[PDB]
């Protein structure tokens, strides 16, 4: 079945995943070096073995393409994936004047009442980002996140480079180019930023009139992250294909450190006892073509009949 | 056998390699997305099915580690791999006053007498690089080549960053880090340089006290290039392992566009009918440890009993 590579990867780190300790103090089972191939012509690879929220993926991806670095847009679409970082920033800001909030991720998970103070303080912040233009510009701006990295790579000579916009014109004019690469890995910022990008670099390849994309992902959360990671780059693949009047080949996913947090073994095992279903079918708006000006309504998912979602603790 | 992954990759692009046209006007058979795993504990992966020159690899690698960008060092060790680029540069230089020399790669290959003028003019240049300090500094300096990219990545604030030197200290202090990445892909220079790096980015991974490395290679010459490409990164892997008092795991080779030039089909087919042999054993100098100060004599290859070399035309 289409998602089988995913189930086969989860399966394997259960068999050969040696125990690896890590940054987030929650143990992991790890493997290094892996590759998955998805034929995007068989269907859209949104896992059917567990409900995964397309909405979060769609808004987030668009956010990237727009060249956005501001949380505001996401909240504006009920997307709270990136909040934690914009919050962490304001909480350190001297202007912040409230409860201790230190290590809030760890502390909330281990304290029912602290998690209460946290969520109230957060809702506050998110509203302030949404309403205070100045506040937004100050704390709603992540800065060095994919959208900037893809669409505005700052040079040494001050100027900015729209990698992704140049790679698409390079594909329109030189499909057969072996240098259709886009990178999110800047040696200059990498040691200072909080979360160096997970999806280090991706590459395009056009042959037979079909476009495929390879993604290099240095680190990976098998249960909570890969399911999304997949549909984010498989969606990008159609989006570029649509823009370039091209077909759709494969989404090839290469991993560096693929891992399974110890606190997710029972969850992965249950999902593993599930039996896949036919894949959902992606439908992009025919008329509209320049993908950067796309909005939620232009990408339509069909026939997604998932299994019930599976809840699990995060690693922090 | 150890090199079997290599023979299995060459084999496959013969079966499924669709025809892809390219920059070097010589047709290719191509595949996109592939991965090979080599257990460096079984032996050093220098192909036994065809003599490959370790000397060229060893000098070149050291050249990289030294942070060198100057051709002089290589010539000084009879290594002429990079000449063509330093030559191309001088030939365009107004100071150059000799024969037409345009498209010399194509023109020499297709003209016995032109190739004569070329080789005489080249020997000249190489000597001038070796003897004229000023000439060397001016034309013997490639500038943006791995050695600089690895060991001196220019920032926007002028300063330089020794990625590789920082990654090794990061491994000495944080083996279990999922961010031990080194990149040669700079979005800022990439569109101007002649040959954007082939070996885009590599990553380290330490587990069980064994160090492994994954390399992402966007483009690849299966017959003439991969054989080298392999021993260059498998050697780097021991070199870092030695420096860090670590063991040796696997060398994982992930490819983007792997290809076989049409003008090499008979050559690859003959090699394919060869039967591998036990692998050569790499012996690094026990006393010496800081790999950056290494010299040819510190790395010793053993038991390399190759088949006769196989000559073939290059692609230009
Ligand atoms: N969509 C996501 C979000 C996060 N991660 C995870 C993987 C690691 O758990 C951490 C990234 O690695 P590091 O901790 O070294 O920064 O983030 C992931 O794979 N996919
Ligand atoms: N050691 C080497 C030297 C060269 N190449 C080849 C692969 C391609 O033929 C070209 C690089 O890609 P591009 O032409 O897109 O720059 O150089 C390679 O694989 N290995």
- Cα-Cα-Cα-Cα dihedral of B153, B155, B158, B162, to 10°? -30
Residue with tokens 């060095």: A144
- Mutate-to-test residue for ligand 2 from B219, B254, B258, highest number of ligand atoms within 8 A of CB: B219
Distance CA A118, CA A122 (A): 6
Alpha helices in B110-249 (DSSP H): 114-131, 133-139, 146-151, 163-173, 226-243
Residue with tokens 């510190």: B298
3-state secondary structure of A285: coil
Technique employed here was: X-ray
Q: Among all residues of chain B, which has the CA nearest to that of A254? A: B254
> Directed axis angle between helix A4-15 and helix A265-272, to 10°?
130
Q: Kindly give the distance from the C-alpha atom of residue A148 to the centroid of ligand 2, in angstroms, as a whole number.
A: 30
Q: Residue B179: CB within 6 Å of ligand 2? A: no
CA nearest to B256, candidates B314, B178, B200, B205: B200
Distance CA A72, CA A78 (A): 10
CA nearest to A230, candidates A5, A8, A69: A5
Distance CA B143, CA B195 (A): 12
Q: Residue B308's CB: how many other CB atoms inside 10 A?
A: 8
Q: Do B155 and A156 touch (CB under 8 A)?
A: yes
Contact A295, A58 (CB under 8 A): no
The ligand 1 atom at the shortest distance from the C-alpha of residue A221 is 19
Q: Residue A102's CB: how many other CB atoms inside 10 A?
A: 9
Alpha helices in B161-225 (DSSP H): 163-173
Of A176, A181, A218, nearest to B22 by CB-CB distance is A176
Instruction: Name the DSSP class of A62.
Output: H
Q: From the centroid of its chain, how far is CA A15? A: 26
The ligand 2 atom at the shortest distance from the C-alpha of residue B217 is 19
Report the gap between the CA of A149 and the closest CA in chain B (Å).
Answer: 10
- Which residues of A13-99 form beta strands (DSSP E)? 18-20, 28-39
Report the gap between the CA of A36 and the closest CA in chain B (Å).
Answer: 9
3-state secondary structure of A313: coil
Distance CA A280, CA A306 (A): 9
Distance CA A66, CA A21 (A): 37
**CA-closest residue to ligand 1 atom 9:** A221
Q: Which residues have CB under 8 Å from A155's CB, separation 6+?
A: A161, B156, B188
Q: How many CB pairs under 8 A join A and B?
A: 133
Beta bridge partners of A205: A212
Distance CA A13, CA A6 (A): 11
Q: How long, in residues, is chain B?
A: 316
Q: Do B176 and A208 touch (CB under 8 A)?
A: no
Distance CA B52, CA B40 (A): 18
Tell me if A22 is assigned to a ligand binding site. Answer: no
From residue A86, how far is each of A54, A118, A167 by CA, in Å? 23, 14, 30
Tell me if A260 is assigned to a ligand binding site. Answer: yes
Residues in A touching B214 (Cβ below 8 Å): 32-33, 256
Run of H or E including A147: helix A146-151
Distance CA B223, CA B217 (A): 15
Contact B226, B6 (CB under 8 A): yes
- DSSP-derived pairing of the beta strands B281-284 and A18-20: unpaired
Query: Order of strands across the sheet with B18-20?
Result: B18-20, B28-39, B247-261, B210-221, B199-207, B181-183
Q: Residue B221: CB within 6 Å of ligand 2? A: yes
Distance CA A5, CA A2 (A): 7
Q: Residue A195's CB: how many other CB atoms inside 10 A?
A: 12
> What is the residue-wise DSSP string for A174-214?
-TT-TT-EEE---TTTTTTSSS--SEEEEEEEEETTEEEEE
3-state secondary structure of A11: helix
Distance CA A104, CA A118 (A): 7
Domain spanning B1-316 has what CATH number?
3.30.572.10
Beta bridge partners of B254: B35, B216
Q: Do B181 and A163 touch (CB under 8 A)?
A: no
Radius of gyration of chain A (CA): 20
From residue B198, how far is each of A155, A299, B38, B185 by CA, in Å? 22, 35, 20, 9
Radius of gyration of chain B (CA): 20
Q: Identify the residues whose C-beta falls under 6 Å from ligand 1.
A: A 23, 195-196, 198, 219-221, 225, 228-229; B 178-179
Distance CA B202, CA B171 (A): 14
User: Mutation test of the interface with chain A: which of B250, B254, B255, B259, choosing the one with the most A Cβ atoms within 10 A?
Assistant: B254
From residue A81, how far is each of A77, B134, B258 by CA, in Å? 11, 57, 37
Number of the ligand closest to the Cα of A232: 1
Task: Report the sign of the C-alpha dihedral through residues B103, B109, B114, B117, in that order.
Answer: positive
Q: Residue A311: CB within 6 Å of ligand 2? A: no
Contact B102, B88 (CB under 8 A): no
Contact A150, A144 (CB under 8 A): no
Q: Among all residues of chain B, which has the CA nearest to that of A21? A: B176
Q: Among all residues of chain B, which has the CA nearest to that of A221? A: B178
């Amino acid at each position: 079945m289409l998602e089988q590579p995913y189930l086969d990867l989860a399966k394997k780190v259960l068999d050969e995943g040696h125990f690896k300790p890590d940054r987030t103090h929650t143990g992991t089972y790890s493997i290094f070096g892996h590759q998955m191939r998805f034929d995007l012509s068989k269907g859209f690879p949104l896992l059917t073995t567990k409900k995964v929220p397309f909405g979060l993926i769609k808004s987030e991806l668009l956010w990237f393409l727009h060249g956005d670095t501001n949380i505001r847009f996401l909240l504006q679409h009920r997307n709270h994936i990136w909040d934690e970082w914009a919050f962490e920033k304001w909480v350190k800001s001297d202007e912040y004047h409230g409860p201790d909030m230190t290590d809030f991720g760890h502390r909330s998970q281990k304290d029912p009442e602290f998690a209460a103070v946290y969520h109230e303080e957060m809702a506050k912040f998110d509203d302030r980002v949404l309403h205070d233009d100045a506040f937004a510009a100050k704390y709603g701006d992540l800065g060095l996140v994919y959208g900037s990295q893809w669409r505005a790579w700052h040079t040494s000579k001050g100027d900015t480079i729209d990698q992704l916009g140049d790679v698409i014109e390079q594909i329109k004019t030189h499909p057969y180019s072996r240098r259709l690469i886009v990178s999110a890995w800047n040696p200059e910022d990498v040691p200072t930023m909080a979360l160096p990008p997970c999806h280090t670099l991706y590459q395009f390849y056009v042959n037979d009139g079909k476009l495929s994309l390879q993604l290099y992902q240095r680190s990976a959360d098998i249960f909570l992250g890969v399911p999304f990671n997949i549909a984010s780059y498989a969606l990008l693949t159609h989006l570029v294909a649509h823009e370039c009047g091209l077909e759709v080949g494969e989404f090839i996913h290469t991993f560096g450190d693929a891992h399974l947090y110890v606190n997710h073994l029972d969850q992965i095992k249950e999902q593993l006892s599930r039996t896949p279903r036919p894949a959902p079918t992606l439908q992009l708006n025919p008329d509209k073509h320049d993908i950067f000006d796309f909005d939620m309504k232009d990408i339509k998912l069909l026939n997604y009949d998932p299994y019930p979602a599976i809840k699990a603790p995060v690693a922090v």
